[PDB]
Amino acid sequence: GSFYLPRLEYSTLPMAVDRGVGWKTLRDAGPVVFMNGWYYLTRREDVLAALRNPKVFSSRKALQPPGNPLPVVPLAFDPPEHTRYRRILQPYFSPAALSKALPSLRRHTVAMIDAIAGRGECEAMADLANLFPFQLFLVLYGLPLEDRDRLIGWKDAVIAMSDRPHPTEADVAAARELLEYLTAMVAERRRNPGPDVLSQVQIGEDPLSEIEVLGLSHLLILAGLDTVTAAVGFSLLELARRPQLRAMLRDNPKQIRVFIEEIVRLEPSAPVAPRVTTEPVTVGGMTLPAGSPVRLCMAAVNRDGSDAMSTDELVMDGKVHRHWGFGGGPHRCLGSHLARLELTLLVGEWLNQIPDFELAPDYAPEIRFPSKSFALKNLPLRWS
């Protein structure tokens, strides 16, 4: 039996400079590590089993908000409700379904790179990574392109206020404006359904309600955009400091795919998944009572050294690339195929117009830690 609970202060983890060092510090503390109210499960055997066991490791108990909120479709649901949502949404998010959008997404990506390439410099987060996901979101779901500025502003306000009592007056107005904006859209799509996703999920044999589509739309905006922003930054960072990799990847979709898998493996934008247990569980000989809040450490598992595909290094070769940067079990990222499509498009079109570039002088990449983001703070790039 394990009766001595390791405890760490989250804010002291050495995470700003090198995530490998940060996750190793946590993993080496033990299979179960208590930090700031949560039990972190750090080892592959436990993390993957837990992700794969929604009955025991509940998402709803960890993620259902208080009050009477918009339903967080499907993130905050357990089976059987979760299973229905995933069955309904799966066909719209498959590689084959999303591949049909590629000409449009490529055209918009090319235009975004076009405006940057002539400058010889940029700060890649503010100037591209922060803007690109919402741009493609408007394209994918048929929203007015001129609404990008205010939609990004609403998203940023809602994300920043989520973890914080005492909401600022500006914060509540932004949340209300976003809700009103999305509500009008969803109602129009129910009355006049086009061939698009948000229309089609509201009709057919098992239609979603307007409130369900509103909750889904909110979730896609809050969970599906900044995650890709973070991955764009890490993609361009690693390319900026690896000239021969840049050369190899230009016009090389097969290897760009491999590179993107490595970026998501090594710098997963959501490196832990929260759950609450529904019955006693024993992890590493330690028994946790029912109702225990746990955080499952996917990013640590991806780096645990247990095979050649799980090291702290960027590994471009090897016949197999696999990881849990998109999660695992039934909640595995609904948008994983979209994220891959968008990231590979971005890298390819960036290298087509900006094949050679470098970090600005005396720049040392860091994330803000602790914070609500595992993205780079900034990324100053130079070329020409």
Provide the binding-site residues for ligand HEM, judged by CB under 6 A: 59, 74-75, 86, 219-220, 223-224, 227-228, 231, 264, 268-270, 273, 325-327, 331, 333-335, 338-339
User: For residue 273, how many other CB atoms are within 10 A of its CB?
Assistant: 25
Q: Is 119 in the site for Cl ion (CB under 5 A)?
A: yes
Which of 107, 164, 368, 372 is in the footprint of Cl ion by CB under 5 A?
368
Which of 54, 133, 348, 365 is in the footprint of Cl ion by CB under 5 A?
348
Stretch that binds Cl ion, among 14-22, 28-36, 185-193, 362-370 (CB under 5 A): 362-370
Residue nearest to ligand HEM (CB): 335
**Min CB(73)–ligand HEM separation in Å:** 8
Give the one entry of Cl ion, ligand HEM, none that residue 64 binds, where binding means its C-beta sits below a cut-off of 5 to 8 angstroms depending on kind.
Cl ion
**Min CB(345)–Cl ion separation in Å:** 6
Give the one entry of ligand HEM, Cl ion, none that residue 72 binds, where binding means its C-beta sits below a cut-off of 5 to 8 angstroms depending on kind.
Cl ion
C-beta of residue 50 within 8 angstroms of C-beta of residue 331: no
| Tokens read off for 81 | 């409700």
**Min CB(250)–Cl ion separation in Å:** 9
**Min CB(230)–Cl ion separation in Å:** 14
**Min CB(118)–Cl ion separation in Å:** 8
Cβ proximity to Cl ion: between 44 and 155 the closer is: 44
User: Do you know the residue count of the chain?
Assistant: 384
Residue 100 burial (CB < 10 Å; 0-12/13-18/19+)? exposed
Which of 71, 271, 325, 365 is in the footprint of Cl ion by CB under 5 A?
71
Stretch that binds Cl ion, among 31-39, 149-157, 269-277, 344-352 (CB under 5 A): 344-352
List, as own/partner pairs, every contact residues 331-334 make where C-beta atoms lie below 8 angstroms and the sequence separation is at least 24, other chains included. Answer: 331/51, 331/54, 331/59, 331/74, 331/75, 331/82, 331/273, 332/51, 334/74, 334/86, 334/89, 334/90, 334/93
Give the one entry of ligand HEM, Cl ion, none that residue 268 binds, where binding means its C-beta sits below a cut-off of 5 to 8 angstroms depending on kind.
ligand HEM
Residue among 152, 148, 172 nearest 161 (CA):
172
| Tokens read off for 235 | 């993609």
Site residues for Cl ion per CB under 5 A: 64, 71-72, 76, 119, 253, 348, 368, 377
